[PDB]
Design a binder for this molecule. Sequence first.
Ligand SMILES: Nc1ccn([C@H]2C[C@H](O)[C@@H](COP(=O)(O)OP(=O)(O)OP(=O)(O)O)O2)c(=O)n1
Ligand SMILES: [Ca+2]
Ligand SMILES: [Ca+2]
Lengths: 115, 52, 357, 308, 49
Amino acid sequence: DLDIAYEGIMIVHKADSTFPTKIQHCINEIPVMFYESEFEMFEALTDLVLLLDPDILSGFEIHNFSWGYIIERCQKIHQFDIVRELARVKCSDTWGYAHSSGIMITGRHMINIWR
Amino acid sequence: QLLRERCVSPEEFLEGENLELDSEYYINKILIPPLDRLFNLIGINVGNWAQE
Amino acid sequence: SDYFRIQLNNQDYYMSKPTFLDPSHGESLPLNQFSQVPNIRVFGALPTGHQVLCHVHGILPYMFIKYDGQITDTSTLRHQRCAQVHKTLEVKIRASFKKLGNLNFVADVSVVKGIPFYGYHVGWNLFYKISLLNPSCLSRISELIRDGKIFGKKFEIYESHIPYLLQWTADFNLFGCSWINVDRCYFRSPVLNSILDIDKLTINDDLQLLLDRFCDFKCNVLSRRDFPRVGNGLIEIDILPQFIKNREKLQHRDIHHDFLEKLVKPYVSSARDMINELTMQREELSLKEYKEPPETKRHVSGHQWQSSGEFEAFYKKAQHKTSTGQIPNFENFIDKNQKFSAINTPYEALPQLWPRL
Amino acid sequence: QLLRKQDYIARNIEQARLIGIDFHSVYYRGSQFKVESFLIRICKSESFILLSPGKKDVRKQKALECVPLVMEPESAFYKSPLIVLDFQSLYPSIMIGYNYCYSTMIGRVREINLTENNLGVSKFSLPRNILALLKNDVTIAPNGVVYAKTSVRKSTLSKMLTDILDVRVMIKKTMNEIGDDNTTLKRLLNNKQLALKLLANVTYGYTSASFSGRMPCSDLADSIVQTGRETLEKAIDIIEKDETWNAKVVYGDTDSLFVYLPGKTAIEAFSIGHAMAERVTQNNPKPIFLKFEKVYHPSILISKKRYV
Amino acid sequence: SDEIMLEDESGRVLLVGDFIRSTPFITGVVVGILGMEAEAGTFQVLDIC
DNA sequence: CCCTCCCCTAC
DNA sequence: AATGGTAGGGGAGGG
Ligand SMILES: Nc1ccn([C@H]2C[C@H](O)[C@@H](COP(=O)(O)OP(=O)(O)OP(=O)(O)O)O2)c(=O)n1
Ligand SMILES: [Ca+2]
Ligand SMILES: [Ca+2]
C-alpha cells in the first residue's frame, strides 16, 4: 500500500508552456509526468518497474505494440537493451510468438492478453 | 471470378463507390446447403423455396 | 510461522564458480575439483509482500544408467568402477565437445538401488547416478550415451526427459506458487537494497521483525567482496540444500522390493488444499456436507472378451514355456540374498555431495 | 478487467499449485509437462526409476492398432424422447478399474519369450517362474497384454487419477447444488472441472505418444481404447437386451448412447434413463459409472459428431 | 462532474464563487468573466459580460 | 466427378 | 523451440 496512485501517464514534451498544465488540468485525477525525450521516458519506465517490481507484465498484443514496440524502439534507434534493464537481475524463440508472448524477461512473466 | 479474386475486407467494402454483396453467392452457397441437409432429413428441399 | 517462507513466482538457473557455499569435490574423483557448478535463482515474495531473490546451491542434475557389475561386490570395487566410468565419460565428452583435472561436465558417479517403472519389476536393480555440472548439455550427453559413442555398447538412459528445475522441485517437495519453508538463510551485501530509494518506502514493522528473527549481522551476512548482489530488488538470500525443510514431509515407501502388498487415498498432496478450499467456499454457501455412496457392482466372472479363450490358451502355453520341475511360492520366489543394505536409495542418495556446514 | 472477469491469474495460480509447475509453464508449455510433474513425484515417493527413450526409439515402436467406436447415426427427425447417456471420465476410470499402468505390464500374451520381449519402446526379460506364480493374479486385456492384479501391486497412474477425479466430482457436486448464484461462481467451477477433465485426458494421452513423445507405450493405450470399445459394446447389448425397455441405440461417440423411446411421455423417460444407467453401472468395475444427465425430446441426427 | 469552467483555446479554470452559480449556462457560450484567483487554479467570479 | 489443401469441431 | 491422441465433415481449386 505505497504511494504510487496505481496509475500514471508519461508524455514527451520538448517545452509551449501551456501543454503540460492543460494536460494536467484535463486529467485532474492521475499524476502526469513530462519528459524531454523518449530515452528519458524509457529510463523512467525502467525505474518505475524496478520500484514496484511486478511479477507480471501484460498488455493487448504486446508483440507489435506496447512492450514489443518499446523493445524494438530501444534496440533499433537508441541501441539500448531495455530487456536486460527491466529484469530482476543485474547480470529467437519461434515457439514463443506462436502460442504465447515471445518476450522473455528474467524474473517477470509476460502475458499476451489477446491470446 | 473465383471466390479468392473478390475477397473484399470491411474497410475496402465500406469505402468502395460501387460495391454490393454477392447476394446470389451468399444466399446459395452459405444458406442452401445446411438447410438442405437439415430439411432433407425431413423430406423437403429448400432450394425450391428460393427460386420462387 | 517459525520458518522463512518464500513463494515460487519464477525460477531460473545459471553457472558460476564454486565458492565455499558450493560443492567442489566428489566421491569418485575427489582429487579433481569443479570448474563450474549450477546455481538456481528463485524469484519469490515474502509473506509480507516484499520480493526476495534466493540462490540455491548444491543442486546438481543427474541421470541413471544400468549397473554393469554384479551385486556381489565388496563395496571397494564399486568405487573403482565409478571412478573408471567417470574418467571414461569425462574423456569422451571432452573429445566430443572439443591428467584430467578440473572436472567440467561430470561431477560424480555413485551406485544406487532402484526399481524400473517401464514394466513389472518386483526386485531391486542397481543403477548409476551420473551427477552432472551443466544441465543445459545434459540431454546432449544422453544423446551420446544412448548412441554408443561413449562406451562400446548402447546404454538406455533413465530419468533424462525430466528437466533440471522439475527434478529440483520434485526432490524437495516444492510446488509452483507455494511456499518454501526454510529455517536458515545467508544474507548478502546490504540487506535493504538501495537501488534508487526502496530501502525506506517498502520496509514496515513486519519485515523488520522477519529480519530481526533471521538476520544476525554478525555471522549470518555474507561478505560484499565475495558475494555481491546481482538482484534489482529487495533482500537477497542464499540457502543450502540442507536448509530446505519442505522435504522430510514426503512419505517414502518401499512396497515394490518384494511381494509386500500380497503379504491412504490422498497420494497427491497438492489436491488436499484444493479440497479444503472447496469445502470452505461451499460451507460459505450454507451447503451441508459432502459424501458419496458406493454402488454394489457385480462384474462378470472374468470380464471376458471376444478372444478371452485364445488369451487363456496362449497364457497356458507361455506358462508352460517360461517354467523350469518345481513350484513357485510368493515367499520364496525372490532370493533372500544380496542384502542391499550399504547401497543407497535415490532419496537416501541425494543428501550426499552436499558441500558442508 | 478482462483478466479479472475471467479470473485468469488466480485460475493459473491454482492450476500451478495443483500440478507443481511454475506459473509460466502452465500456458507456455504443453500437456506432457504436467503429467511428467505428477509422475516424477508419485514415482520418487516409491523409489521408481523411469525410462527415457530417444527419438529413434519412439518412432520404431509398434503403431496404434486399436480405434474407438463411432456408430453411424440413423439420420432422421426424432419426435419422441431421445435419452443421451454418457460415461464420466471413461478412460481414466478404465485405467483405475482394470489397473492399467507401466508398473503392471508383464507382456503381450502371445510370443512370450524368456530372454527377448517387447513392450512399446523397451526390451526386458521375465524371470523363470513368474507366470506359473501369477497365473491367478492377472487381468488379460482385450488387446492381449497381461497386467498384474491389484492384489499384487496397485498401479501409480491409478492414484493420481483417483485423486484428480475425486476433486473433479467434488467440484461438480458443489456446482450442481446452486441455482440462485449467477454464473459468477458456476462458470468458475465449470472451468475448474473442465481443466481437471483435460488433465485426466492428457494423462491418458501421455500414453503411446504417436508423435513427439517422451515416454510412450503403444500397448497400454491400445488396451485402453480396446477395453473402452468393449465396455461401450457391452453397454449397447445390456440396453438392447431388455424386453420391457423396447429401446434401440441410434448413435454414440465412443462413450455415449442415444436410445430412442417412440412415444414415451418424456416425464417417464427420466426414470427409464436412470434405470438403464443403474443397470449398466452395476455390471462394471468400481470407478466406472454411467450418467443420464439429459434427454432430447426433439432432435435431429445429421451425421457423426453433428446433431441438434 | 458538477463545475463550470472557462476555456479560451489555452486551458480551463474552475469558475468558483457565488455570482456564477445564480445564472443558467449552456456549454459553448462565451462570457467575459472578471474574477480573482484565490487559493488554487480556481477562478472566482465578480461580474460577467 | 476425384484428388489435395484448408478449417475446426467433437470424442 | 517445443509439441498428448483419434475421427469427421464441408468447401475451393485444379483438374
Ligand atoms: N481433449 C480430449 C477429449 C476426450 N478424450 C477421450 C478420453 C475420454 O475418456 C474420452 C471421453 O471423452 P469426454 O469428452 O466425454 O470426457 P470424459 O468422458 O473423460 O469426462 P466427462 O464425461 O465428465 O465429460 O475421450 C481425449 O483423449 N482428449
Ligand atoms: Ca464422457
Ligand atoms: Ca460424449
